[PDB]
Amino acid sequence: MTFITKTPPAAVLLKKAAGIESGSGEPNRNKVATIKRDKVREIAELKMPDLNAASIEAAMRMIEGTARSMGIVVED
Template sequence: MTTQKKVSRQVTLELEAGNAAMVDIGKMLGPTGVNTRQLKLDYDEATAPQRGEIVPVVVTVFEDRSYALRYKTPPTAHLIRKAVGLEKGAGRPGSQTVAKLSREQLREIAERKLPDLNTDDVEAAMRQIAGTARSMGVLVAD
């Protein structure tokens, strides 16, 4: 019979892939007693191929101070900004357009985000991504 570890805390962190900031990790997980240096090394090693992107991770901390990491896909807004080459979205979305996203780019982002979305239909995922793009002032081309 296997005994399940008891979860003491679960936190989602958005960190830079391959180069997580110790400050962010320490601020959120310092009070739990987890070895933050080892957690940073584990995260950096696992996300090294995605350097330059933001990769969220769900950290589950157990009562014995061990942890488990579950990686998610980068935030939708980050992927849209990267695809169209923006630093940030529009100041007044709806009345201001700052970039144009092609259908191909929209499909690529939707396929990448699919594991984290509440659908398994690429067309539905594309509609969700298009909504985020519109809220950033990015026009979706037809």
């Protein structure tokens, strides 16, 4: 738990960005939002300067499979 610096994690930031306000709120293995790499692109850019990603496609790579663990799909 840290609320001082460093953007949020992929899933969380994903739920906020691609997860809209909260079409789910208590999701699990379903889908509530779908975006192309354009969103997971900018999204990873925010958590880029703080995430252990390895590059743009690399951040979205983990950020993508990450969104699937919540309720947001991603199209390459």
